[PDB]
Amino acid sequence: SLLTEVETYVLSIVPSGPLKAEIAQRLEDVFAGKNTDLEVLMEWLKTRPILSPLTKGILGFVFTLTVPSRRFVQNALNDPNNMDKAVKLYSKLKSEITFHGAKEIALSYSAGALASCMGLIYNRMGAVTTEVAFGLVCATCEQIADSQ
């Protein structure tokens, strides 16, 4: 029942318009379990015109964690010392297993460290569990959508 907490949070950073409409459907399709060919929605993201590199990074991060079994996302997630806090946070998320446990800790750090922390996990999608990674996405999305 936590999959909806990722949905609404991701739909908070995407700029309003005819793009939040397209992304909305593509999300609630893989969140129902029909799409399998991972490298289709990946390409679909990369070519979309009103998406910031950061949004393409988070969306690409979420899609990968779903689908059963890229450089344009790594270069979006990863510029001063925010990497320094990310490395230590990354070493902590290994300890945590549940979604809410990591989200509680990740929400306590800067928005810069979180987005870069996601870059660390993308290199190893097996180092940490999925529930935690969602918690990182949820904490990341909220803090960057908390500026205004």
Residue numbers in the entry: 2 to 70, 77 to 85, 89 to 158
Task: Show the paper's wording.
As the most abundant viral protein encoded by the M gene segment, matrix protein 1 (M1) forms a shell underneath a host cell-derived lipid biolayer to connect the vRNPs with the viral envelope in mature virions. The full-length M1 protein includes 252 amino acids consisting of a highly organized N-terminal domain and a flexible but less ordered C-terminal domain that are linked by a protease-sensitive loop. So far, only the N-terminal domain of M1 has been structurally resolved at an atomic level, showing that at neutral pH the physiological monomers have a high tendency to oligomerize via a so-called ‘face-to-back’ arrangement, whereas at acidic pH the N-terminal domain exists as a dimeric structure in a so-called ‘face-to-face’ arrangement.
G88R but not G88E was originally acquired by the virus as a spontaneous compensatory mutation after NLS disruption. M(NLS-88R) M1, similar to wt-M1, is able to switch from a face-to-back monomer–monomer association at neutral pH to a face-to-face-oriented dimeric conformation at acidic pH. The face-to-back monomeric arrangement of M1 occurring at neutral pH is likely necessary for the formation and maintenance of a confluent and strong matrix layer underneath the viral envelope, whereas the face-to-face dimeric arrangement at acidic pH may describe M1 that has dissociated from the extended matrix layer. Compared with M(NLS-88E), that M(NLS-88R) has less difficulty to break the fulcrum likely translates into a smaller cooperative energy requirement of monomer-to-dimer conversion under subtle pH changes. This flexibility facilitates M(NLS-88R) M1 to dissociate from vRNP in the acidified endosome, thus prompting virus replication in vitro. Our results also indicate that the compensatory G88R mutation was not a random mutation but was chosen by the virus purposefully to retain pH-dependent conformational flexibility for efficient virus replication.
